[PDB]
Design an enzyme around this catalytic site. Structure first.
Site, PDB file in Angstrom:
ATOM      1  CB  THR A 196      -1.016  -0.214   1.289  1.00 28.30           C
ATOM      2  OG1 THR A 196      -1.863  -1.070   1.266  1.00 28.30           O
ATOM      3  CG2 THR A 196      -1.762   1.297   1.070  1.00 28.30           C
ATOM      4  CD  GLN A 197       1.944   1.438  -3.695  1.00 30.67           C
ATOM      5  OE1 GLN A 197       0.762   1.575  -3.571  1.00 30.67           O
ATOM      6  NE2 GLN A 197       2.591   1.201  -4.958  1.00 30.67           N
TER       7      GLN A 197
ATOM      8  CG  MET B 281      -3.209  -6.297   0.095  1.00 26.78           C
ATOM      9  SD  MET B 281      -4.875  -5.564  -0.532  1.00 26.78           S
ATOM     10  CE  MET B 281      -4.811  -4.149   0.741  1.00 26.78           C
TER      11      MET B 281
END
Ligand SMILES: *[C@@]([C])([C][O])[C@](*)(=O)[C]([C]C1=[C][C]=[C][C]=[C]1)[N]C(=O)[C]([C]C1=[C][N]C2=C1[C]=[C][C]=[C]2)[N]C(=O)[C]([C])[N]C(=O)C1=C([C])C2=C([C]1)[C]=[C][C]=[C]2
Ligand SMILES: [Mg+2]
Lengths: 240, 244, 222, 233, 235, 211, 231, 195
Positions: free
Chosen positions: D1-2, D107
């Site tokens: 996730t970013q 993810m």
């Protein structure tokens, strides 16, 4: 890891390491198993080359796997401990997952499977051990007696012997044991087991061990004096 | 590949023997004799150091008799370095048991564990076995005083009196002759030293060529004391028994 | 924070006849209030006389269909070109879905075809793998709009025979393929009126012993 | 996730009778800061495909390298690398779509929205979309971000359905695209005047136009607008 | 020494060829396929009279529609049977159906060549896998440690195999009944066995579509042995 | 849902509803919440439909393998325990399953409750699901060991009806089973709409409801 | 002699005997023929039985809708290698929406076989394969040897007595290459080619196995009464 | 589960454990036995999170039974309690700890003494004359502090235990459906069938 294939086929279709493991069993002290009508008796030889022994603490030849099953053996003593430990662990594992104690047939099949696995796994040698597994299934009064060997084959026996001079005592059992009418009582079953060992043992003093297993987890080991009385009665009848 | 150079340490002979175990036993038969004698009121451990020198520092030296815990000790016959590997494992096992159950480890359980380790090296791994035979002297509240022996095969047995190392055939005959069941520690001490004095390959048995130890209930009230004898104390017991 | 799921809208409908089966679905693909495509096929011929549609999150829907088509291919390889029966396909799909129990395929799946007795069959799944055989099933956005209509017009629920006043039910007479397609078209026309995610086009796949046939119908584009 | 840092805005495209057109501006935004003004977001793959990318620029540069490596790998042990076994738009798209969906399933997405425009071996037009979620769809017109809201409505007036594609010429299609880019410049706060346009035709091949500008802009009516209600001066 | 997966100059794997020699030393097992069912029969070969012969389990159930007979190092068969049973029931879990006999046999044979320096050697046991499915009907397969499997109308494995196979060559035809096949297995077993054939030292079994896989009682086999003796004495 | 099961003189009764919900929407009118593991073993389903189907069908695989290895049918006690141990592997991972393992073995008729926590209970009578409280009320007041097969079937049927009426998330139809020493016996699918009006008239119950 | 104990050992003349022994297993195997035109590609295989009660061992395996092979030698090794091809064909389709080129399929088999010839512990594959297929560059025929060597050919044959069929194809080269848009005539040429490798036995209904792939023809295998037409 | 009590008298240990098992708002069972025999003269009662309790108890039971068979010898209650404590102390720092509290009642045949050990889920061991887990002690310890003597008979121990249960039944908001009582002494373990 050490992955070397030690148990392999030879040109004539033999696995020598498994066959040489049977030679280790041939060297081991004699063990005998006889099942009566309502019991099973396990007899075992103790070689009298070793005196000054402490019989209280010396590892006994017959081992309880559970409260209702016992295991005796012939061959390498150290090897037998590994099978016994595995068998004991599996017995508790079976009670824990299935909520019933192992059957004698199941326990035998497991021990035989361990022996087989060591004949086609890399980096290991076969167990130099043959076992006699005896007992009574839970809520069952039919006697059970099985035999295993290094190759991993197993089978049920009315009576059987393994170890050194087993050929002789098997000869005795084949002519003396009647299938139509097996030893009806405990006395008759023990007497026949002691008689069979007296063909091979030498002296009937501390060289014979006897373990009686009855239904419903009733297992007891006979003492020296109790066995000595059988030895006395057998020879007195023989003097005729 | 590598197969070419593999000795195959864990195989049966045609006769059903384990080559490396048998050869390890041959090694042990050249080691200094170690004797154990169990009495009603204690246990004796006696052992012969191998051809020593005058310049060897004896009082700080230990090649035969080792302490596993406060209740259990061992006499060694064979490769000392191999024995120390096993001894340290046994010391750890005894402490693991004490931590788990809050009770001192029963003698047999410790013996079985070490013997199982030896067994493993004969069945798998492709490594040489430990060239060591132990005499275990110990006490617990179940069986009281106990003597055991283990060898490279991983097989162990219990004894009233036993020898390992060199001249065990001769030593065992002498022990079998003079040993009695109602024997006491002071008598057992004398028997152990007399047996070594007759079986030794040396010209004469002296204090500097011996290691000695006792496990006695001869401790103040219901408890057990280990006594690893000092050089001067071995010299005194040699004079007392009438050997020197 | 990254949201791995999305909603592509759409609605699907499966009806099982006596000796046929239909699997219909609209061709509109959307995100939020925008149209991605007015014609993006959603119902697929997977081989072995089986049709399939995974409605919901299109990425997961395409992945599942792709994996099932693959499962059919390997079923032929492994079992001597044996035909994959509809019941066997259904059970296989359960295991495909449950392999992702803790990170689900966000789709409502329906398959249709014929059983081993030649009768019409529809199977319907939830995102985690519960499935069962059904006669009638609408899935997706406008499922709640359509299902009650099918309970009434396919299974004759709450319908009784005049004169008896509630004593005798309307008998469950079988429906022809022409009658079923009428109910399908009216279901989607009604759903298009009252649901914003439904529209553009309707594609129907009909399955018989003769094979898989397609029919396309325009829907309102607003 | 970013989270996306340096970003590119809308990519717009449409089909016409003999091919496809795709366009995208040359801006690399850093939030509200119009940081980089020379960023090419249309990336050709061979002479038959153009990949247009919006979203995170660091992830775009990564994808650009994957495509460059894809061409290299396809040429390995391939005598027909510049002929029958050359990379097709459909091959390039499916590869990217596979990557995008795998990354979202771990993810750790590539924070992009991609449109693959090109012409296949048999002359068929190829136009398909894929994004950070692995969601794919095709349409006669496709656009990302703001383009989806403002450009598609204009482009769908030219090609409203499949049957309008043969009736649409390259001049009409290019005119529609250029008008759409002007509208986006009026109304997208994260857009720029400078843009690139690419045409992939089945006859004339790949035409890549750089340094285009939005022109013919209406601003004069602004002079008359005064206050926010009641103000006259 | 030498590799376990080594080729001979003739192009054969030494270990696979040597395992075949072990199978020749095994007790005889015979299988006959008919349109009414497949019959499986084995020689028990007890090493002593004290050995309870009913505990000798050389015929085994894999599924309701698949049976199996073994010959050679029978201890090696246990893991193969375990895998077969797992494969059969697992396929029923995944596909809500019975598994094809060929597919089951192929799954067992995939284990065969998984040996090297995986298990340390090939299996020293051959299997006769008999069963029924809707696609190909009644089937009999011979699974070897080479990983190869042949389908057979009739097949014998073990010590008396080549003598029995020659006899099966003459006797088998496509119109055999189940009863005829039963007697034929008993006949050939009696011919190649060392000891005299009876209900205690030989075992019969069959697989039919209706009743599935069944091991025959000693009382049921005894009657078939008596029926055999009378029909041989009839001419 | 509502499920129940109880032991009695002539074996064990098993009754379940058939409703399935996705929020307040009735997703299914007729769902099978019983699994036929074998001719002598049944399993009820409550909670996540997928979890119930997957794990109990996997139990049937494992119960089937038991028969092949041992040449003998698995006990209800052992079967229930295998299932509870499966649940214990996915401990705290979010499985939702409530099931009763019903059958007949050598000890006689057997009934075990098993849930996602790993809880495993032996007992005479159990009821699971959102409507279990309504079912327990009828069961507790009308249960006897001396019940006839006909009366016992009705009790389990009537107990589900009670729950189907009051519980919004229970209804559709009633599926009945009777387990004997010769195996289980299916006693049909019974629509609650029709069953309600029938019971009301014949029994005189549900007086407050107008019909 | 002293250098044939394992695959990791060169002989003094630079030979790999274990690979050569694996090659020997192919020569013992039953004959199989491969040939192609510009439109179609054909496999013809003589199946072998154990005895009269036994079935005839299958020789041809399907890898994809557009590709497949015939085997000669250790059948289990063909199953492993064909399984690998199935996966590689399938990886190309799922990832790139692209049918795997026959030439690239040959390169992948070469590389898989090679790894087994250079490492200790393992062994070379004991099987030869004839791969046919139809891709974007038309019809193709490949010959695979477990040494790793893969060769693209107009026609060939492998197995016992394969030299006879190979000579026939070498004479017929100019004729059978021109058989375009006629599957039956191309098969006839293959059946006539494999007939040159027969001794004592002849082509029967359950003996012969044929496969074909082409322009508008998926890879299909013909066995039983389906090949009686060509006998 | 909820209430488990223990009391060590002159020549025995008495354990009382509730019979209720609740799931949601419904009492599923009112005859549940929250105990396992670890060895002939050692009994362990347990209480904690659903499922974990039985799994832990049976795991301990298996280990002690394995030890008994291996050595042909019964471990002392002290040794068993230490083994159990270590398993819990090991567990509390695991990824998912076992939330189980136990009482171990045993008769030491060597010392001829009854012994009661209280161990919580953290691995906190204490030897006590009487003990409890959870809220049970809040109601009962004042009665036990007052009435308990070390020379009490088994019958007097049961009477004091009845008084504790009566106090629980009066002042707890929780219906725990009575208790199963078991006695551990030199002759082994037996259950009081009427309480
Ligand atoms: C009561 C109806 C609960 O309200 C009962 O417990 C049923 C049990 C049941 C068992 C097997 C099969 C069907 C039902 N439970 C459900 O219906 C559950 C309850 C539930 C919903 N969410 C949820 C639940 C439980 C635990 C956690 C979360 N409902 C479902 O599982 C929902 C998700 N399933 C469906 O709505 C659909 C199913 C199943 C299905 C649908 C929809 C469509 C096609 C085939 C199957
Ligand atoms: Mg609409």
């Amino acid at each position: 890891g050490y992955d070397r294939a030690l148990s392999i086929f030879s040109p004539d279709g033999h696995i020598f390491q498994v066959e040489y493991a049977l030679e280790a069993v041939k060297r081991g002290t004699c063990a005998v198993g006889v099942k009566g009508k309502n019991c099973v008796v396990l007899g075992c030889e103790r070689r009298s080359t070793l005196k000054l022994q402490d019989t209280r603490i010396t590892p006994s030849k017959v081992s309880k796997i559970d409260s209702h099953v016992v295991l005796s053996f012939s061959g390498l003593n150290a090897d037998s401990r590994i099978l016994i430990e595995k068998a004991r662990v599996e017995a508790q594992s079976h009670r824990l997952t299935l909520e019933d104690p192992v059957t004698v047939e199941y326990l035998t099949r497991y021990v035989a499977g361990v022996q087989q696995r060591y004949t086609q796994s890399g980096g290991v040698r076969p167990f130099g051990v043959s076992t006699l597994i005896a007992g009574f299934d839970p809520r069952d009064d039919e006697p059970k007696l099985y035999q295993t060997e290094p190759s991993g084959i197993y089978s049920s026996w009315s009576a059987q012997t393994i170890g050194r001079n087993s050929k002789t005592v098997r000869e005795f059992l084949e002519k003396n044991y009647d299938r139509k009418e097996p030893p009806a009582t405990v006395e008759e079953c023990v007497k026949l087991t002691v008689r069979s060992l007296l063909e091979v043992v030498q002296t009937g003093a501390k060289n014979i061990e006897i373990t009686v297993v009855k239904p419903d987890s009733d297992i007891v080991a006979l003492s020296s004096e109790e066995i000595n009385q059988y030895v006395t009665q057998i020879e007195q009848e023989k003097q005729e | 590949g590598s197969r070419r150079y593999d000795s195959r340490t864990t195989i049966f002979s045609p006769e059903g023997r384990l080559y490396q175990v048998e050869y390890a036993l041959e090694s042990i038969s050249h080691a200094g004799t170690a004797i154990g004698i169990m009495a009603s009121d204690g246990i004796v451990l006696a052992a012969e150091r191998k051809v020593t020198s005058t310049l060897l520092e004896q009082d700080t030296s230990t090649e035969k008799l080792y302490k596993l815990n406060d209740k259990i000790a061992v006499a060694v016959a064979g490769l000392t370095a191999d024995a120390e590997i096993l001894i340290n494992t046994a010391r750890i096992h005894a402490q693991n048991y004490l931590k788990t159950y809050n009770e001192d480890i029963p003698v047999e359980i410790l013996v079985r564990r070490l013997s199982d380790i030896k067994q493993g090296y004969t069945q798998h791994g492709g490594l040489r076995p430990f060239g060591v035979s132990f005499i275990y002297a110990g006490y617990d509240d179940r069986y009281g005083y106990q003597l055991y022996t283990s060898n490279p095969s991983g097989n162990y047995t219990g004894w009233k009196a036993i020898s390992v190392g060199a001249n065990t055939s001769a030593a065992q005959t002498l022990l079998q002759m003079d040993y009695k069941d109602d024997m006491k520690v002071d008598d057992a001490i004398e028997l152990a030293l007399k047996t070594l004095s007759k079986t030794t390959d040396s010209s004469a048995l002296t204090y500097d060529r011996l290691e000695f130890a006792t496990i006695r209930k001869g401790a103040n009230d219901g408890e057990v004391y280990q006594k690893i004898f000092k050089p001067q104390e071995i010299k005194d017991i040699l004079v007392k028994t009438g050997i020197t | 924070q990254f949201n791995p799921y999305g909603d592509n809208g759409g609605t699907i409908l499966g009806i099982a006849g006596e000796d046929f089966a239909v699997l219909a679905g609209d061709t509109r693909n959307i995100t939020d209030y925008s149209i991605n495509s007015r014609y993006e096929p959603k119902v697929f011929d997977c081989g072995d006389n089986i049709v399939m549609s995974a409605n919901g999150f299109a990425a997961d829907g395409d992945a599942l269909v792709k994996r099932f088509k693959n499962s059919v291919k390997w079923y032929h390889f492994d079992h001597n070109d044996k035909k994959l029966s509809i019941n066997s396909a259904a059970r296989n799909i359960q295991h495909l879905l449950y392999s992702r129990r803790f990170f689900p395929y966000y789709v409502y799946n329906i398959i249709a075809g014929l059983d081993e007795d030649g009768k019409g069959a529809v199977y319907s799944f939830d995102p985690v793998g519960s499935y069962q055989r059904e006669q009638c099933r609408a899935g997706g956005a406008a499922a709640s709009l359509i299902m009650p209509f099918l309970d009434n017009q396919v299974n004759f629920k709450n319908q009784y025979e005049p004169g008896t006043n509630g004593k005798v039910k309307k008998p469950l007479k079988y429906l022809s393929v022409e009658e079923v397609i009428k109910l399908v078209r009216d279901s989607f026309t009604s759903a298009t009126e009252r649901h914003i995610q439904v529209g553009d086009g309707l594609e129907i796949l009909i399955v018989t012993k003769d094979g898989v046939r397609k029919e396309f119908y325009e829907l309102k584009r607003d | 996730t970013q989270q996306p840092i340096v970003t590119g805005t809308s990519v717009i495209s449409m089909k016409y009778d003999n091919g496809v057109i795709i366009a995208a501006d040359n801006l690399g935004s850093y939030g509200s800061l119009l940081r980089f003004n020379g960023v090419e977001r249309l990336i050709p793959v061979g002479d038959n495909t153009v990949v247009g990318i919006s979203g995170d620029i660091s992830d775009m540069q990564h994808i650009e390298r994957l495509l460059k490596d894809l061409v290299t790998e396809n040429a390995y042990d391939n005598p027909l690398a510049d002929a029958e076994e050359a990379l097709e738009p459909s091959y390039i798209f499916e590869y990217l779509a596979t990557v995008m969906y795998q990354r979202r399933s771990k993810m750790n997405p590539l924070w992009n929205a991609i449109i693959v425009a090109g012409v296949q071996s048999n002359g068929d037009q190829f136009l398909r979309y894929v994004n950070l979620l692995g969601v794919t769809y095709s349409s006669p017109t496709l656009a990302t971000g703001f383009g989806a809201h403002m450009a598609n409505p204009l482009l769908r007036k030219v090609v409203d359905r499949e049957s309008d594609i043969p009736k649409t010429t390259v001049q009409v299609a290019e005119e529609a695209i250029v008008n759409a880019m002007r509208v986006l410049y009026y109304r997208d706060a994260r857009s720029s005047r400078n843009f690139s346009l690419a045409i992939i035709d089945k006859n004339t091949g790949l035409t890549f136009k750089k340094n285009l500008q939005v022109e013919n802009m209406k601003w004069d009516f602004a002079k008359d607008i005064k206050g926010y209600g009641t103000q006259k001066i | 020494d030498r590799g376990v997966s080594t080729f001979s100059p003739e192009g054969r794997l030494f270990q696979v060829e040597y395992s075949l020699e072990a199978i020749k030393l095994g007790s005889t097992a015979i299988g006959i396929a008919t349109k009414e069912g497949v019959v499986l029969g084995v020689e028990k070969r007890a090493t002593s009279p004290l050995l309870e012969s009913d505990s000798i389990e050389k015929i085994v159930e894999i599924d309701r529609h698949i049976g199996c007979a073994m010959s050679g190092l029978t201890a090696d068969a246990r893991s193969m049977i375990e895998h077969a049973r797992t494969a059969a029931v697992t396929h029923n879990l995944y596909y809500d159906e019975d598994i094809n006999v060929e597919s089951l046999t192929q799954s067992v044979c995939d284990l065969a060549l998984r040996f090297g320096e995986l298990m340390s050697r090939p299996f020293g046991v051959a299997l006769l896998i008999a069963g029924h499915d809707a696609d190909d009907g009644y089937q009999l397969f011979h699974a070897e440690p080479s990983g190869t499997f042949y389908r057979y109308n009739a097949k014998a494995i073990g010590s008396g195999s080549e003598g029995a196979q020659a006899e099966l060559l003459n006797e088998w035809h496509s119109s055999l009944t189940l009863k005829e096949a039963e007697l034929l297995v008993l006949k050939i077993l009696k011919q190649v066995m060392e000891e005299k054939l009876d209900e205690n030292n030989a075992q019969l079994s069959c697989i039919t579509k209706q009743d599935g896989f069944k091991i025959y009682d000693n009382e049921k086999t005894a009657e078939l042995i008596k029926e055999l003796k009378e029909k041989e004495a009839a001419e | 849902t509502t499920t129940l099961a109880f032991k009695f003189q002539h074996g064990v009764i098993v009754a379940v509803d058939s409703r399935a919900t996705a929020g307040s929407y009735i997703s299914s009118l007729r769902m099978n919440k019983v699994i036929e593991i074998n001719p002598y073993l049944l399993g009820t389903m409550s909670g996540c439909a997928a979890d119930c189907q997957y794990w109990e069908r996997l139990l049937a695989k494992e119960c089937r393998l038991y028969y092949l290895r041992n040449g003998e049918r698995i006990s209800v006690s052992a079967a229930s325990k295998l299932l509870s141990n499966m649940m214990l592997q996915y401990r705290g991972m979010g499985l939702s399953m409530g099931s009763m393992i019903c059958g007949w073995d050598k000890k006689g008729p057997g009934l075990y409750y098993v849930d996602d926590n790993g809880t495993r209970l032996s007992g005479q009578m159990f009821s699971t699901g959102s409507g279990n409280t309504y079912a327990y009320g009828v069961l507790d007041s009308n249960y006897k060991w001396d019940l006839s097969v006909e009366d016992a079937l009705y009790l389990g049927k009537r107990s589900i009806l009670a729950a189907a009426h009051r519980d919004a998330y229970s209804g559709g139809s009633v599926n009945l089973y009777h387990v004997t020493e010769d195996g289980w016996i299916y006693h049909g699918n019974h629509d609650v709409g029709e069953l309600f009006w029938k019971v009301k008239e014949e029994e005189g119950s549900f007086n407050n409801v107008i019909g | 002699n002293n250098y044939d104990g394992d695959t990791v050992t060169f002989s003094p003349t630079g030979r790999l005997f274990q690979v050569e022994y694996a090659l020997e297993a192919i020569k013992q195997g039953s004959v199989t023929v491969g040939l192609r035109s510009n439109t179609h590609a054909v496999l013809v295989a003589l199946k072998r039985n154990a005895d009269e009660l036994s079935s005839y061992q299958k020789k041809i395996i399907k890898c994809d809708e557009h590709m497949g092979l015939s085997l000669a030698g250790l059948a289990p090794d063909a199953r492993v290698l064909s399984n690998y091809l199935r996966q590689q064909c399938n990886y190309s389709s799922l990832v790139f929406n692209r049918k795997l080129a026959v030439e690239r399929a040959g390169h992948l088999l070469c590389d898989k076989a090679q790894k087994n010839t250079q490492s200790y512990g393992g062994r070379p594959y004991g099987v030869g394969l004839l791969i046919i297929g139809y891709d974007k560059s038309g019809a193709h025929l490949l010959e695979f040897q477990p040494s790793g060597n893969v060769t693209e050919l107009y026609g060939t044959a492998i197995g016992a007595r394969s030299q006879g069929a190979k000579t026939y194809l070498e004479r017929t080269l100019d004729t059978f290459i021109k058989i375009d848009g006629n599957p039956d005539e191309l098969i006839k040429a293959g059946v006539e080619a494999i007939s040159q490798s027969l001794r004592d036995e002849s082509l029967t209904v359950d003996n012969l196995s044929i496969a074909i792939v082409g322009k508008d023809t998926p890879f299909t295998i013909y066995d039983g009464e389906a090949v009686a037409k060509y006998i | 589960m909820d209430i488990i009590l223990g009391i060590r008298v002159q020549d025995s240990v008495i354990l009382a454990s509730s019979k209720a098992v609740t799931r949601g708002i419904s009492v599923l069972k009112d005859s549940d036995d929250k105990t396992r025999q670890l060895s002939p003269h050692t009994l362990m009662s347990f209480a904690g999170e659903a499922g974990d309790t039985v799994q832990f108890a049976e795991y301990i039971q298996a280990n002690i039974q394995l030890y008994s068979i291996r050595e042909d010898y019964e471990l002392s209650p002290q040794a068993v309690s230490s083994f159990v404590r270590q398993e819990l102390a090991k567990s509390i720092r695991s990824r998912r700890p076992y939330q189980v509290n136990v009482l171990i009642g045993g008769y030491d045949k060597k010392k001829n003494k009854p012994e009661l050990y209280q161990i919580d889920y953290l691995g906190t061991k204490v030897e006590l004359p009487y003990g409890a887990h959870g809220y049970s002690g809040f109601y009962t310890f004042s009665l036990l502090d007052h009435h308990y003597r070390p020379d009490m008979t088994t019958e007097e121990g049961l009477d004091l235990l009845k008084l504790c249960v009566q106090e629980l039944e009066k002042r707890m908001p929780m219906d725990f459906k009575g208790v199963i009582v078991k006695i551990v002494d030199k002759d082994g373990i037996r259950q009081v069938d009427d309480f």
